[PDB]
Ligand binder design. Structure first.
Ligand SMILES: O=C(Cn1ccc2c(=O)[nH]c(N3CCOCC3)nc21)Nc1ccncc1Cl
Ligand SMILES: O=C(Cn1ccc2c(=O)[nH]c(N3CCOCC3)nc21)Nc1ccncc1Cl
Ligand SMILES: [Cl-]
Ligand SMILES: [Cl-]
Lengths: 122, 122
């Protein structure tokens, strides 16, 4: 019965990404080997089982730095972080295995499923 | 060239609303006369000119309480806050004028335009 605004969610996500690009109200640094990426915990939680599980725990909720597994490919992580904030996933033959393994680690099941479909179509 | 996830933005917004409902990582209380509403500043900024302008200013960015104009109808505000987190706007004959005036105050231009269309269709 409510009026539906079809573009609203995408508009919100766009603006959250704009805030990320200006480092406004970002509240965590994700360290992946020699690279670091800032983000909003709320978005990470919305998009990742790993981050949801980390930040829902009152023991870790207030952490401002998260060190990921050193084995994680920083580029794979970056691709997934960008996907979180844009809805667009950059899969290529050169990055498919790194992105897929990283998505497994981040517990992003729908993305893992999409990587499986990409492999199947390759 | 990137794979588009058509439901992703709405999924993110849904999960942000779930976090709001559990008061997880909310960082501001919006006081509207005798009522109060918690939220995430990032979402408020994404959806409102007023909140964008308030929290982008380094003078006010860290405020944890915002007192709105006492004249603002709390129900009108609540309807708009729910819209921010859901994409669904509950317009009715009983609330149209309060919602519209509140949307003007919050500088939510697309919503104001929609209220004008509602008035025109009434
Ligand atoms: O749902 C997510 C995050 N999210 C996105 C994809 C995805 C996924 O594929 N799996 C998991 N989990 C969770 C932890 O346990 C194992 C599986 N979470 C995922 N956030 C969430 C859920 C409920 N209210 C608020 C929030 Cl923010
Ligand atoms: O765009 C908005 C918020 N938003 C939503 C609707 C709406 C609107 O109708 N008007 C205005 N303004 C802004 C202030 O000046 C007057 C008009 N902002 C609006 N956030 C935003 C913009 C750019 N990067 C990051 C962010 Cl979060
Ligand atoms: Cl900030
Ligand atoms: Cl919290």
């Amino acid at each position: 019965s409510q009026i539906q605004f079809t573009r609203h969610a995408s508009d919100v996500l766009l603006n959250l990404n704009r805030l990320r690009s200006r480092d406004i109200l970002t509240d965590v640094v994700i360290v992946v080997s020699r690279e670091q990426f800032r983000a909003h915990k709320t978005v990470l939680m919305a998009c990742s089982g790993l981050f949801y599980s980390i930040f829902t725990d009152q023991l870790k909720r207030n952490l401002s730095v998260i060190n990921l597994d050193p084995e994680i490919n920083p580029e794979g992580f970056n691709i997934l972080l960008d996907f979180m904030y844009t809805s667009r996933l950059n899969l290529r033959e050169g990055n498919i295995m790194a992105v897929m393994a990283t998505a497994m680690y981040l517990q992003m099941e729908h993305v893992v499923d999409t990587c499986r479909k990409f492999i199947k179509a390759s």
